[PDB]
């Protein structure tokens, strides 16, 4: 879990790889691992998740109780979620005077959230709120506390990361939000 970076971009993961990642990480013993899956479409791969991780098998009950789903349409709502996660972490660290809490924050659709706020507010306000929320998630995941941790993963389709795939070897108007984050906020990209 401590393999994960403070913020990692996962491009176009297949539904099977994502299910498998969740299953392996949330079945670790002697720790409480939670997945907060935050998305702009309500598209958690539930049908595949149920096949790979059947909720009718008693071993799987806890995994389902430790996944939290939120549909989040803009950066304002993402900032509010980030508030709630930081309340959860803070209160866990406090109360730890018991098994460590490990949160995986997984956000899909962040480019769509940015696009929504951008149209409801201003280009400056959008970039400012994006910046505040990601810098906050970095300092949160960097905290040396052993009782509660967070790691964030950002999913984007490959076609929004062409600067990466073209580097790793077109006509362009600026960076996509994915390229901008790859360059300015994310520690790594996991293929």
């Amino acid at each position: 879990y401590e393999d994960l970076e403070l913020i990692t971009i996962w491009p176009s993961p297949t539904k099977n790889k994502l299910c498998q990642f969740i299953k392996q990480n949330l079945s670790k013993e002697h720790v409480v691992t939670q997945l907060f899956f935050i998305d702009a479409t309500s598209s958690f791969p539930l049908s595949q998740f149920q096949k790979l991780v059947p909720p009718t098998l008693p071993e799987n009950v806890r995994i389902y109780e430790n996944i939290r789903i939120n549909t989040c349409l803009d950066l304002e709502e993402l900032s509010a979620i980030t508030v709630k996660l930081l309340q959860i972490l803070s209160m866990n660290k406090i109360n730890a005077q018991t098994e460590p809490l490990k949160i995986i924050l997984y956000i899909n659709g962040l480019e769509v959230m940015f696009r929504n706020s951008q149209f409801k507010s201003s280009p400056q306000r959008s970039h400012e709120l994006l910046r505040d929320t990601l810098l906050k998630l970095r300092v949160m995941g960097n905290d040396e506390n052993e009782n509660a941790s967070i790691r964030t993963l950002l999913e984007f389709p490959k076609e929004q990361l062409l600067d990466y795939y073209l580097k790793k070897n077109r006509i362009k108007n600026g960076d996509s939000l994915a390229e901008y984050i790859w360059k300015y906020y994310a520690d790594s990209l996991f293929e």
Partner: protein, 215 residues
């Protein structure tokens, strides 16, 4: 009115000076480097370039560098070095908290350093590094950056540390899909006028080259 000075005055200082790594020699004369106190690096890199790493990982003995790590890179557990003290706090990721912290460091170094979990005060603070000023970004922006410069200049006058800062080049400030569209970085002159050396890093091929910006 006659003044006669021991030569030892000219070779002794209560201030630290920045020792440029190889990557950065041949930019300024030996006299100019004999006294770099404020250096700003512009680089497009999220993580520190090798020249920046070299400037920073430059601990002699009981000497320490305070690294104000707005980007949460330098203080990550696997990145941390023995010669550094770190400030990586949700109270110190915007320009208002950064200035409150630096004002405390000037007024009461012990109290400010306690925030960085310094148990023992057996060291000389050699330098302060702030990474990345591009994340602190009207005309109120000019005011805050002059206030930042002025406190850093006061710090250097009292504690003797040198100062190194970093920002992203002009590209970052274009924003996502160019929706936010001098120097090759968007910092005010109220800040830049204060720098003894401004370095710019660019890739012209896949080769990074460092150049002075006397812009």
């Amino acid at each position: 009115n006659i003044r006669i000075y021991p030569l030892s005055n000219f070779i002794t200082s209560t201030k630290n000076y920045i020792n440029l790594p190889n990557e950065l020699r041949n930019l300024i004369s030996e006299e100019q480097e004999s006294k770099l106190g404020f250096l700003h690096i512009i680089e497009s890199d999220f993580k520190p370039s090798v020249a920046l790493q070299k400037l920073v990982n430059c601990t002699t003995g009981d000497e320490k560098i305070l690294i104000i790590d707005i980007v949460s890179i330098w203080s990550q557990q696997k990145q941390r070095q023995h010669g550094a003290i770190y400030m990586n706090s949700l109270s110190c990721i915007n320009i208002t908290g950064l200035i409150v912290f630096l004002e405390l460091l000037y007024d009461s170094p012990m109290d400010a350093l306690r925030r960085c979990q310094v148990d023992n005060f057996n060291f000389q603070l050699r330098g302060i590094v702030i990474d990345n000023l591009s994340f602190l970004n009207d005309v109120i922006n000019l005011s805050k950056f002059e206030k930042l410069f002025k406190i850093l200049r006061k710090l250097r006058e009292f504690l003797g540390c040198w100062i190194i800062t970093k920002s992203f080049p002009t590209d970052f400030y274009n924003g996502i899909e160019n929706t936010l569209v001098l120097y090759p970085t968007k910092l005010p002159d109220s800040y830049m006028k204060g720098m003894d050396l401004i370095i710019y890093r660019e890739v012209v091929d896949g080769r990074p080259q460092y150049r002075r910006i006397a812009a």
